[PDB]
Amino acid sequence: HYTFPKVWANSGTTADWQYVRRADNWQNNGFVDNVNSQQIRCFQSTHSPAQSTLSVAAGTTITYGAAPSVYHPGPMQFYLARVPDGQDINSWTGEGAVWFKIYHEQPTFGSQLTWSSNGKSSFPVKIPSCIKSGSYLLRAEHIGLHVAQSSGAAQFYISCAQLSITGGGSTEPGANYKVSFPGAYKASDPGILININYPVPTSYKNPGPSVFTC
Ligand SMILES: [Cu+2]
């Protein structure tokens, strides 16, 4: 149980839900367990814009905050989606096959799976240098897998930040990189329907598309 209420760059912290669309778990710190819900995208059944949009240079690392620290086992993953030219980010929900993955977490494989996200209160998110400047949504998710051996038991903790990415390049992620939310995930996916406990897995297939790099 945690939210992802903040993102920041190089000018101190922001306020909760200042640059992050207020997630529907803002009171209970709970999860989405329905990969078919609109909430799987930005945790909003009713779209509501963030108060502001954060300017960040492509190729730099910003910070996505959690509250309180992440403590369920499983991966952090981050996706970007570029708002079309002529559309206002405040109004854009990010529907269709527009999301590309820029990070996913692999566990360390030992007697148990250990996750570097354990105990972390924030995460560095490296924005690709080569993507086109524009307005973007940055989707954060943590997937808690402690009881995920049953369908519908994986716990998704999600939010989305509004960014203005500057100083871009000209690389467009391929069609194979871009997915929709809902759409990208199925309840049967091997990194969602999974017993991480015993026997311990010796590999882990993150859900969603390949990580896009320049
Ligand atoms: Cu919890």
Author numbering: 1 to 214
How do the authors describe this structure?
NcLPMO9F primarily attacks crystalline cellulose and promotes, in combination with cellulases, faster and more complete surface degradation. The structure of NcLPMO9F demonstrates that this LPMO shares the essential features of fungal LPMOs, including a β-sandwich fold and a catalytic surface-exposed copper centre in which the copper is coordinated by the ligands His1, His72 and Tyr157. We determined that NcLPMO9F is expressed in Pichia pastoris as a 214-residue non-glycosylated protein. As observed for the fungal LPMO GH61D from Phanerochaete chrysosporium, the N-terminal histidine in NcLPMO9F is not methylated, in contrast to the methylation of other N. crassa LPMOs expressed using the natural fungal host1523. Both NCS molecules in the NcLPMO9F crystal have copper ligated by four protein atoms in tetrahedral coordination and exhibit distorted octahedral coordination of the copper with mer-[MA3B3] geometry together with external ligands. In molecule A, two water molecules, one axial and one equatorial, satisfy the octahedral sphere. In molecule B, both water molecules are replaced by the carboxylate oxygen atoms of Asp33 from molecule A, which is similar to the coordination sphere observed in Streptomyces coelicolor ScLPMO10B where two oxygen atoms in an acetate molecule occupy the fourth equatorial and axial position on the solvent-facing side of Cu(II)34. These observations emphasize the possibility of the 4-coordinate Cu(II) in NcLPMO9F to accept one axial, and possibly also a fourth equatorial ligand (water or other). We observed very rapid NcCYT-to-NcLPMO9F ET with a haem b-kobs value of 67.2±2.3 s–1. Our results demonstrate unequivocally that, in the N. crassa CDH IIA-LPMO9F pair, the reduced haem b alone acts as the reductant of the NcLPMO9F copper centre in vitro.
